[PDB]
């Protein structure tokens, strides 16, 4: 759970603009 | 419980949880009401729990209205079954609730008791909900 | 009037209509500028690619 949560939430960065591959 | 006598189509697409409620957003029957603030598929079991909570808090007097009706069937496929092989059978009866929709209404002489009963109902509900009043 | 339209952003990630509006304006690279008439056609092109260009009124 933690791994997916972190990988997903790191899209909430100014560089990514709320989007990342594979969420 | 609340279950439709019948539905024209028993396997329906999920109600679209979008936009604020366009109708039923004001207390039209009672003096106080519970206004939803988030989208949720409020099930007939949740409606039953909320109305029983309100009725048991107001005890003897008072009148309760349940504006939403759970007439939308959410289906569930049998447990431990793979994806495919058709759509599941109807499992839950839900009312598509949107923000601003008044779900329950209450008339009761005592304002504190009415608000406490509506608070009971809100705690039973799966969404953020506030106590609105007819007096605008 | 006259509009000086300078492409500030890139066509990478831009839609087909936006890229075609840019080339219709005459903009092929970032920071390229074109002086055009402030007519309805120019305003429509600017509206389509507004996020990709900066527009100034030529004195």
């Amino acid at each position: 759970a933690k791994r997916g949560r972190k990988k997903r939430d790191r899209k909430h960065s100014k560089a990514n603009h709320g989007k990342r591959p594979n969420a | 419980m609340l279950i439709p006598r019948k539905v024209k189509h028993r396997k329906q697409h999920h109600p679209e949880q979008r936009g604020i409620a366009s109708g039923g957003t004001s207390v039209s029957f009672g003096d106080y009401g519970i206004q939803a603030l988030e989208h949720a598929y409020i099930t007939n079991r949740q409606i039953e729990s909320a109305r029983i909570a309100i009725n048991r808090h107001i005890k003897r007097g008072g009148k309760v209205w349940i504006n939403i009706f759970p007439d939308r069937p959410l289906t569930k496929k049998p447990a431990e079954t793979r994806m495919g092989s058709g759509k599941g059978s109807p499992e839950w009866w839900v009312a598509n609730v949107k923000p601003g929709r008044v779900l329950f209404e209450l008339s009761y002489p005592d304002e504190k008791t009415a608000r406490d009963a509506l608070t009971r109902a809100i705690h039973k509900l799966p969404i953020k909900a506030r106590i609105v009043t007819r007096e605008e | 009037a006259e509009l000086k339209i300078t492409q500030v952003r890139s066509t990478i990630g831009a839609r087909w209509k936006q890229r075609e509006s840019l080339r219709t304006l005459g903009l092929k690279k970032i920071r390229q500028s074109v002086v055009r008439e402030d007519n309805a056609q120019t305003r429509g092109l600017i509206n389509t690619v507004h996020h990709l260009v900066e527009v100034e009124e030529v004195g």
């Binding site: - | 049998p78 079954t81 092989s85 058709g86 759509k87 | -």
Partner: protein, 79 residues
């Protein structure tokens, strides 16, 4: 445990084929439809399968008569 559904006919590609203002030739199919959603107007015939076709050359126009949508052909002035 299976689904009783899964069948469907071919899409019949109905609808308007020549819209308002389009210049058409005589005998050109204007509307593929089931029934008279549009009715044959002026210089427009109705096919056996409800296909509205132009009877004369001209430009397609859509009108309303007795509250019924109709497809007409307006003659085009010779150049």
């Amino acid at each position: 445990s299976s689904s009783r559904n899964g069948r469907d006919s071919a899409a019949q590609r109905l609808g308007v084929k020549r819209f308002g203002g389009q210049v058409v030739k005589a005998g050109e199919i204007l509307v593929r439809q089931r029934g008279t959603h549009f009715h044959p107007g002026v210089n427009v015939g109705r096919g056996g399968d409800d296909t509205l076709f132009a009877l004369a050359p001209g430009a397609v126009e859509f009108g309303a008569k007795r509250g019924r949508k109709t497809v007409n052909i307006v003659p085009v002035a010779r150049p």
